[PDB]
Amino acid sequence: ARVTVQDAVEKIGNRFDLVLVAARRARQMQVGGKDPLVPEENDKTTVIALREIEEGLINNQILDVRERQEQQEQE
Amino acid sequence: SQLKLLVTRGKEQGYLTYAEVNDHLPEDIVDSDQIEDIIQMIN
């Protein structure tokens, strides 16, 4: 589990931007199709997306550019 | 009229009790219904 989200806050600043960015990524993984960027420790999607935000490899700009890349290659 | 002093009295005190309302009414107001309606006005 994850006791504190203090580290994930600094990566994104706002505590509400963090929730909205992590719910987005965790729903990408949940429904669906996308995979975690981090070795999942038998976690749920919520703490997985939080832990990925902790490591700086998930955020609004990264998720949006990942949107754009697949929007391109969907064609 | 006298009810004017009653309204300003209630505004001074911040309330109005049934005693003062029974006092300050128009004396020949024999109608309990308009009594109820005038207290409902002042309230």
């Binding site: - | 004396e27 020949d28 107001i29 024999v30």
Partner: protein, 50 residues
């Protein structure tokens, strides 16, 4: 002081002001006023200090 503010002076005016208080509108009189007072608290028909 309460006499100096008493607008009444004699008994029958007392009764008539009590009458105008109790059942307003009705023109009061000697007989009806004395009857109202003597049947307010002083008649076993109506009052009862048990």
């Amino acid at each position: 002081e309460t006499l100096r503010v008493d607008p009444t002076n004699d008994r029958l005016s007392a009764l008539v002001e009590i009458y105008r208080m109790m059942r307003p509108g009705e023109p009061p009189t000697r007989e009806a006023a004395e009857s109202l007072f003597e049947n307010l608290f002083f008649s076993e028909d109506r009052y009862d200090l048990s």
